[PDB]
Amino acid sequence: VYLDRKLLTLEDKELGSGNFGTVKKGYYQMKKVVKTVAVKILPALKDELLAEANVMQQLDNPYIVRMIGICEAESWMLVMEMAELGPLNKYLQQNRHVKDKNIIELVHQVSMGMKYLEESNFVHRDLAARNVLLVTQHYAKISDFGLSKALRADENYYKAWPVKWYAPECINYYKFSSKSDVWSFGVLMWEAFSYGQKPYRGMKGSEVTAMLEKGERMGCPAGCPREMYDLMNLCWTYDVENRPGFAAVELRLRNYYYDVVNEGHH
Ligand SMILES: CC(C)(C)NC(=O)c1c[nH]c2ncc(-c3ncn4c3CCCC4)nc12
Numbered sequence: 001v002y003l004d005r006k007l008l009t010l011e012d013k014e015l016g017s018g019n020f021g022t023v024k025k026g027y028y029q030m031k032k033v034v035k036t037v038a039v040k041i042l043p044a045l046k047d048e049l050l051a052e053a054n055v056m057q058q059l060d061n062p063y064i065v066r067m068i069g070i071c072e073a074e075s076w077m078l079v080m081e082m083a084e085l086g087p088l089n090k091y092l093q094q095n096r097h098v099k100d101k102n103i104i105e106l107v108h109q110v111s112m113g114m115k116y117l118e119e120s121n122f123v124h125r126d127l128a129a130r131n132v133l134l135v136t137q138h139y140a141k142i143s144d145f146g147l148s149k150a151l152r153a154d155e156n157y158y159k160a161w162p163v164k165w166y167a168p169e170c171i172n173y174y175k176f177s178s179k180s181d182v183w184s185f186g187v188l189m190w191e192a193f194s195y196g197q198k199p200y201r202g203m204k205g206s207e208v209t210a211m212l213e214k215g216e217r218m219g220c221p222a223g224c225p226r227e228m229y230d231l232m233n234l235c236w237t238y239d240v241e242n243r244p245g246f247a248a249v250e251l252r253l254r255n256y257y258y259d260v261v262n263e264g265h266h
Pocket residue numbers: 015016017020023038040065080081082083084085086087130131133143144
């Protein structure tokens with residue numbers, strides 16, 4: 001887990017900065033090969049980076065960004081695998097010709113990652129299109145575990161804002177569970193089928209909460225299959241018990257993906 005600064009070469013231009021800090025590109029000399037990496041650069045703040053690292057250390061799934069390790073040098077640094085096509089929201093804004101079936105394939109992969117996170121009893125707590133990275137046009141991985149928590153053995157929720165991705169019960173009761181990650185996944189789907197548009201455009205946090213309270217929901221993106229819209233809406237079920245878990249969401253996605261795959265072969 002602890003990497004050697006002298007084996008890491010960082011590009012001086014950064015890939016980006018914002019809420020999440022700074023991300024730089026570099027490469028890291030492995031046992032034999034050299035690996036292109038993305039590096040997130042950072043007192044209770046030292047602890048938050050370590051705590052994110054502690055989470056990622058515990059995860060191993062094809063649809064989750066892999067942590068190479070951490071290094072204390074100029075700054076604390078979290079070194080991750082590189083996703084060349086970058087964040088999914090920025091990619092779809094730039095690539096409007098991306099077909100319906102491809103978008104289904106990408107959000108299915110996200111659901112596979114999340115089903116695994118749910119099984120591991122971690123809550124992500126920041127699931128959004130901006131945190132899905134594209135390794136290829138056909139391979140998405142979840143990242144940014146900065147808010148992620150391991151669930152206690154006795155409860156299915158963590159008790160504590162990107163209000164636009166949050167389920168009512170996060171807003172009402174500060175309660176975060178795999179079910180509220182499913183709410184968040186609905187909005188991520190809405191983002192994906194809207195080619196990376198931000199949700200609830202032009203609305204304030206308070207107005208979104210008010211809209212949700214009256215049972216109103218975002219409408220169907222232009223050209224989004226009804227089956228996918230119906231699934232987003234199921235994700236945004238008010239009642240936490242009746243809202244589907246990721247197993248159910250992943251199965252629904254998988255089966256629809258096979259459907260469209262079969263139609264394309266015809
Ligand atoms: C914290 C955040 C943003 C979730 N990123 C990561 O966790 C990353 C892990 N591997 C990556 N590879 C590329 C980028 C990338 N490529 C282009 N950009 C980025 C991230 C910064 C904006 C532009 N971001 C990450």
